[PDB]
Design a protein around this ligand. Structure first.
Ligand SMILES: Cc1cc2nc3c(=O)[nH]c(=O)nc-3n(C[C@H](O)[C@H](O)[C@H](O)COP(=O)(O)OP(=O)(O)OC[C@H]3O[C@@H](n4cnc5c(N)ncnc54)[C@H](O)[C@@H]3O)c2cc1C
Ligand SMILES: Cc1cc2nc3c(=O)[nH]c(=O)nc-3n(C[C@H](O)[C@H](O)[C@H](O)COP(=O)(O)OP(=O)(O)OC[C@H]3O[C@@H](n4cnc5c(N)ncnc54)[C@H](O)[C@@H]3O)c2cc1C
Lengths: 284, 284
């Protein structure tokens, strides 16, 4: 069904966990993200600029962070947040599973490193989107191509196969893929989304797919799509010294706020966002 | 004599150490402060909001920070910084011992918690000051009272006893005091600095001292006195998202920049300041 919380934290990396441990000062808090917290932490080899942990390996620091949240009774809700609608005094939070409401939101999604595909921006809203399940009814009986950058994208492909006339899945990571037989896996490199007034084809290095929709599925939609009305410049969510965005009650912390992309900056921002959000909840 | 460095960090607490470990990316760096890093860290009992160190004691976290800087060959220069003069393209740094020049400065002095004495602001520049050794020639053959909040203040009293006709030392901490016999220790509580056009007396709870100067000696002068021309509001050094102050080449990080006074905020700010300072050194 629906569940209400005082604070929702969108991301489970350094920034979101820093927010969570500072918000547990009560005030219900929910943290959305991945079971493994942050993929970048796991991939980091030796870390020498996180003060107090000289020479730690990324996966070791990840475990220290996991034990911290576990000691404080903080769990990660393992769902993808698709859209956050600023209703004015609260936020409606749409996810890959259930819908939530929260009084305050802390954006902590990190920063996407991969570039958009050619034609992606051009056809946005004319056949390109960032949430396949959200737009699924629009593609009933149509051809849909999903360019998947994470495992959740596979679930969206499976769902779309129940409505679309044909589903192609283009993986952008190496794994076994848990897809129903109706999904055609296209192990090729996307080149360009093309069309006249709307999407007509996805061109790949060795193949072209006639398709009505192309969904580009990453850990998070671009922030201005995830949070309609949010002020972003240069792909960075713009915040002030209190980590406040342009949307009252919506904060942002970590790589999603701009450079430098470092752990200490991220945890500091998460702390500031959470303490300010809590203050606003007690002052109304 | 004088020594030149690319970056000078003013403070050895969480913020300054975070700056130091991020600036050692070369670029000579000098860190001014106390041997014990930060007094607040030592006094902190259990810390649960420093991500990755759940349940750590303050002195334990202090030791982790000490081992980090030691592993990176970062030493603390154990002197008090008295004044930083923005010369335009560099900074002249006056200390309780030698003078330094630095291309970039990172202010990391923390935030003073004790309030000013009554009359302190009123007589500033008319008998009240924050550096006794700096103003010592002005008090040759005059009466000087030092209200000392740290051990360095004792050294300043000893120096002033060579020039002033009479030196009183009013300690604001419990310890043995290493003072020459010419210094009179006044174990009483300051109440008010009084005078007409200039300082004439220090009133204490049980005694009044006729005095020509009153020096209030804390770990650092107020930031607008430490750094002439620095923009401060509400006792907080005002910085932007890059930790830049109003003075080009001068950054600030940690409690000295405003609330919340927390460790994660401080280390994040120190990191941002240092990485920006380094960038400016490589771009000129
Ligand atoms: C190989 C490598 C080495 C690095 N080494 C260092 C180093 O030595 N020192 C250093 O300071 N920095 C280092 N970094 C950078 C550092 O990892 C980042 O600055 C830091 O991880 C930022 O954390 P964050 O919480 O802002 O974002 P992230 O760490 O990206 O966390 C984001 C998390 O939120 C989840 N999420 C995002 N959007 C949504 C959504 N819509 N719904 C649900 N969940 C979502 C993601 O799945 C992810 O788990 C390194 C990065 C890499 C890639
Ligand atoms: C009892 C107590 C418990 C606390 N518990 C927590 C907690 O659980 N979690 C949390 O997040 N925060 C806590 N805090 C607050 C936290 O300690 C501060 O936010 C943090 O120490 C800020 O560090 P900083 O580097 O900005 O300043 P500081 O820690 O004050 O470091 C300043 C250092 O620079 C030196 N210095 C200053 N001026 C000069 C100068 N002119 N020349 C030379 N050296 C100078 C000082 O001697 C000092 O050593 C606590 C504070 C106290 C007092």
């Amino acid at each position: 069904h629906m569940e209400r919380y005082d604070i929702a934290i969108i991301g489970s990396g350094p920034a979101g966990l820093a927010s969570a441990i500072n918000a547990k000062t009560r005030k219900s808090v929910i943290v959305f993200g991945s079971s493994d917290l942050s993929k970048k932490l796991t991939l980091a080899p030796v870390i020498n600029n996180y003060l107090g942990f000289y020479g730690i390996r990324g996966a070791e620091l990840q475990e220290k962070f996991k034990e911290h949240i576990d000691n404080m009774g903080i769990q990660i809700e393992n769902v993808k947040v698709n859209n956050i609608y600023a209703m004015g005094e609260y936020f409606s939070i749409m996810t890959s599973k259930d819908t939530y409401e929260a009084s305050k939101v802390i954006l902590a999604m990190g920063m996407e490193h991969t570039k958009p595909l050619k034609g992606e921006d051009k056809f946005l809203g004319r056949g390109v989107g960032y949430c396949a399940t959200c737009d699924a009814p629009l593609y009933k009986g149509k051809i849909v191509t999903i360019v998947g950058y994470n495992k959740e994208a596979e679930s969206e492909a499976n769902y779309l196969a129940e409505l679309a006339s044909k589903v192609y899945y283009v993986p952008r990571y190496k794994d076994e893929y848990q897809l129903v037989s109706a999904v055609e896996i296209v192990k090729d490199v996307p080149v360009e989304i093309v069309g006249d007034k709307k999407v007509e084809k996805l061109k790949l290095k060795s193949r072209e797919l006639e398709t009505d929709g192309v969904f580009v599925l990453k850990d998070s939609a671009p922030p201005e799509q995830l949070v309609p009305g949010l002020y972003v410049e240069d792909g960075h969510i713009k915040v002030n010294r209190k980590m406040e965005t342009n949307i009252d009650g919506c904060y942002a912390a970590g790589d999603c706020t701009g450079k430098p992309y470092q752990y200490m900056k991220a945890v500091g921002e998460g702390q500031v966002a959470a303490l300010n959000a809590v203050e606003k909840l007690y002052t109304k």
